[PDB]
């Protein structure tokens, strides 16, 4: 059975671009585990309101797909600002993990990790500082198992998709005993 | 298997930092190793130090202080006259023989803080990576809640080269304990 700190913190963001330095958050989505990758809870699904000025200015590819997703609308609408979603993020996490417990999970976590510390830097702060990031297993599995990789961004169903692939890759290349 | 070539191999990087600020702290040792896709180690690459001035030195929390100055780091700091730019071009002239451009994940421990401070002080060899990692850590993640009874069989040195050699020796011994090769 699992405790506060034995639970790990699942996280997803959308972005108006890659940039790092420059770009904003426009949608956070949290799901909660325990270290056996059952789905204890999952947490707020918050869209960050940005001016049409900042959507207007996207590349072809993010207009395209935050567009057809209905995220473009989603924050438009939204009156939530970034300060709003990271409280509630944080309220949500603060009820099934203790702080800096967790590492940061999920797929392609180093550029959520960037976009978090300048954008929601004590969100960011709530993890521990190591990453569990599904995609290195995925490039170990693409060299050393590639015939596994056959049976394989809306941010919660996004994290459903990582915890998924993990188990897919818990059951078929790692060695449970 | 088949043969590594240009476009099947991987880069190994470790930095040394003068702290944990990914926003304002400085790379003072740089060092990579080239494996191929099966972790067979085809070159080494050239080991680093990057000069700073003593204020940057002196402000060091303890302990960096105590490892760099223990481990001879420092020293080479002081004496070291190649700027970063300097080592990101040694290093990129290392790499280029090697592996093609974008080719190659990020690989080693901690790999996301390393990249952070490629990016802001050497991106030129930032954007020679692929954008993807492959960090041994959250294989030692999974590994210390499914399998935390081969732990223990991780076996010294706090310098970049050092590091690199035991992120290698570490994922050969996942390889061998904790995933399915067959
Ligand atoms: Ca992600
Ligand atoms: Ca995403
Ligand atoms: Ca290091
Ligand atoms: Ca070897
Ligand atoms: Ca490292």
Redesign the interface.
């Known amino acids: 059975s699992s405790t506060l700190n034995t639970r790990l913190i699942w996280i997803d963001l959308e972005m108006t671009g890659l940039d ?1 330095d420059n770009d904003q958050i426009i949608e956070i989505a949290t799901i909660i585990t325990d ?2 990758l059952n789905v204890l809870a999952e947490g707020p699904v918050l869209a960050i309101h940005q001016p049409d000025r900042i959507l207007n200015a996207m590349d072809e590819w993010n207009t395209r797909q935050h567009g057809q997703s209905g995220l473009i609308e989603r924050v438009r609408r939204s009156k939530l600002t970034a300060r709003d979603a990271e409280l509630q993020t944080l309220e949500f996490l603060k009820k099934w993990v203790n702080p800096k417990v967790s ?1 940061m999970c999920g797929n ?3 550029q959520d ?2 976009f978090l ?1 300048r954008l929601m830097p004590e969100l960011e702060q709530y993890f521990h500082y ?8 995925k ?2 599995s693409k ?3 590639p015939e596994i990789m056959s049976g394989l961004h809306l941010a919660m169903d996004d994290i459903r998709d990582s915890i998924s692939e993990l188990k897919y890759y ?1 059951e ?6």
């Open positions: 790092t270290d056996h590492p392609s976590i180093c990790r960037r510390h190591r990453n569990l990031d599904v995609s290195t297993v490039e170990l060299r050393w198992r818990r078929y290349f790692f060695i449970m005993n």
